[PDB]
Design an enzyme around this catalytic site. Sequence first.
Site, PDB file in Angstrom:
ATOM      1  N   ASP A 290      -0.511   2.179  -4.990  1.00 18.31           N
ATOM      2  CA  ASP A 290      -1.436   2.395  -3.872  1.00 18.31           C
ATOM      3  C   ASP A 290      -0.911   1.994  -2.540  1.00 18.31           C
ATOM      4  O   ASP A 290      -0.494   0.864  -2.414  1.00 18.31           O
ATOM      5  CB  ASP A 290      -2.687   1.605  -4.084  1.00 18.31           C
ATOM      6  CG  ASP A 290      -3.448   1.979  -5.339  1.00 18.31           C
ATOM      7  OD1 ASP A 290      -3.209   3.049  -5.913  1.00 18.31           O
ATOM      8  OD2 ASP A 290      -4.296   1.174  -5.716  1.00 18.31           O
TER       9      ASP A 290
ATOM     10  N   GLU B 218     -10.752  -2.237   0.279  1.00 17.83           N
ATOM     11  CA  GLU B 218      -9.573  -1.672  -0.377  1.00 17.83           C
ATOM     12  C   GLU B 218      -8.353  -2.440   0.071  1.00 17.83           C
ATOM     13  O   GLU B 218      -7.480  -2.651  -0.755  1.00 17.83           O
ATOM     14  CB  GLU B 218      -9.233  -0.197  -0.022  1.00 17.83           C
ATOM     15  CG  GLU B 218      -9.735   0.988  -0.798  1.00 17.83           C
ATOM     16  CD  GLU B 218      -9.943   0.824  -2.299  1.00 17.83           C
ATOM     17  OE1 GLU B 218      -9.143   0.202  -3.030  1.00 17.83           O
ATOM     18  OE2 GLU B 218     -10.943   1.342  -2.754  1.00 17.83           O
TER      19      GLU B 218
END
EC number: 3.2.1.17
Length: 129
Positions: free
Chosen positions: A53, A35
């Site tokens: 994000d 990620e």
Amino acid sequence: KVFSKCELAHKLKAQEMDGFGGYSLANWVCMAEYESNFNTRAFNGKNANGSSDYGLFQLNNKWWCKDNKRSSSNACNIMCSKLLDENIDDDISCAKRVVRDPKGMSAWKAWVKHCKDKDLSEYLASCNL
């Protein structure tokens, strides 16, 4: 900052992520590399709508944290900026609350694409750090 693999396994284990959400340490750690690359400054903003994000786990502003743009909310009760930091305790509490939804670790696209279905049996082999 950037963690090494094992660095981060020390730190998450430290905090009981090790069996968490019915997922092992290996799972959690694998999600963080794909990620964010284990970096607490990972940020990815994409204006489909004002989504972005944040951090080591890439926690998105529409549901999980509060920042100034539209698509923000706050289930974790944090200002998203607490995720731009060296300290990853808020990140820990918000991952803990996230895995507890029906999507489980599937809330994380990189984990789905990169750790689910991989044999992680020997992913932390060199880290009992």
